Amino acid sequence: KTRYALKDTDEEVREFLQNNLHLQGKVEGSPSLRWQMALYRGLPGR
Amino acid sequence: APARLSPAIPLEALRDKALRMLGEAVRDGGQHARDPVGGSVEFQFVPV
């Protein structure tokens, strides 16, 4: 959202996010995302 | 007066019990739940 606040185009933010693939969540140890992961894994879809 | 000794209490039960609370406390502390045994984490780990 802040990148969009920089008046950056779609290509600019797409390249901006493409270089931050390593910076995913990876906070599975925290309790805030502990139940969210389980709920997502419990979906009837894919 | 033959001054009295300390009151007795089953030591085997006490040692087995005390290990159980400490084992549970260190296990329940990993979940980082919003409801400790006492008022806070201080009252949960210090008395044991």
Curated annotation (Swiss-Prot), chain B:
It is found in: Sarcoplasmic reticulum membrane. The N-terminus is blocked. Detected in skeletal muscle (at protein level). Fast- or slow-twitch skeletal muscle. It comes from the Eukaryota. The calcium release channel activity resides in the C-terminal region while the remaining part of the protein constitutes the 'foot' structure spanning the junctional gap between the sarcoplasmic reticulum (SR) and the T-tubule. Pore opening is mediated via the cytoplasmic calcium-binding domains that mediate a small rotation of the channel-forming transmembrane regions that then leads to channel opening. Binding of [3H]ryanodine indicates that the heterozygous channel is activated by Ca(2+) concentrations 4-fold lower than normal. Single-cell analysis of cotransfected cells shows a significantly increased resting cytoplasmic Ca(2+) level and a significantly reduced luminal Ca(2+) level. Belongs to the ryanodine receptor (TC 1.A.3.1) family. RYR1 subfamily. Cytosolic calcium-activated calcium channel that mediates the release of Ca(2+) from the sarcoplasmic reticulum into the cytosol and thereby plays a key role in triggering muscle contraction following depolarization of T-tubules. Repeated very high-level exercise increases the open probability of the channel and leads to Ca(2+) leaking into the cytoplasm. Can also mediate the release of Ca(2+) from intracellular stores in neurons, and may thereby promote prolonged Ca(2+) signaling in the brain. Required for normal embryonic development of muscle fibers and skeletal muscle. Homotetramer. Can also form heterotetramers with RYR2. Identified in a complex composed of RYR1, PDE4D, PKA, FKBP1A and protein phosphatase 1 (PP1). Repeated very high-level exercise decreases interaction with PDE4D and protein phosphatase 1 (PP1). Interacts with CALM; CALM with bound calcium inhibits the RYR1 channel activity. Interacts with S100A1. Interacts with FKBP1A; this stabilizes the closed conformation of the channel. Interacts with CACNA1S; interaction with CACNA1S is important for activation of the RYR1 channel. Interacts with CACNB1. This is Ryanodine receptor 1. The chain holds residues 1794 to 1841 of 5037 of the full protein.
